[PDB]
């Protein structure tokens, strides 16, 4: 199944590593006994992978190409 770094975006929020979740349960973390989804992660190497990872979803990357680092600060 597709599978790899759990991606939330920077600044945004957005999830852009999460949406076929509902049938690939490779998003949540085995935590002890919650869904059949924890317990296929219940296994003794996080198979969902441990990885929060934050990065740029296409409107950021937007925000960055059409905009020159996303406009600045304040001054
Ligand atoms: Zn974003």
Same mark, same amino acid.
């Given at each position: ?16 590593? %999460?949406?076929?979740? %509902? ?20 296994? %003794? ?31």
């Amino acid at each position: 199944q597709s599978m790899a770094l759990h991606y939330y975006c920077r600044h945004c929020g957005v999830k852009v590593g %999460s949406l076929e979740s %509902s049938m690939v349960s490779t998003d949540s973390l085995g935590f002890q006994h919650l869904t059949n989804e924890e317990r296929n992660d219940m296994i %003794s190497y996080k198979e969902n992978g441990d990885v929060h990872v934050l990065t740029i979803c296409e409107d950021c990357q937007e925000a960055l190409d059409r905009n020159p680092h996303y406009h600045e600060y304040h001054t």
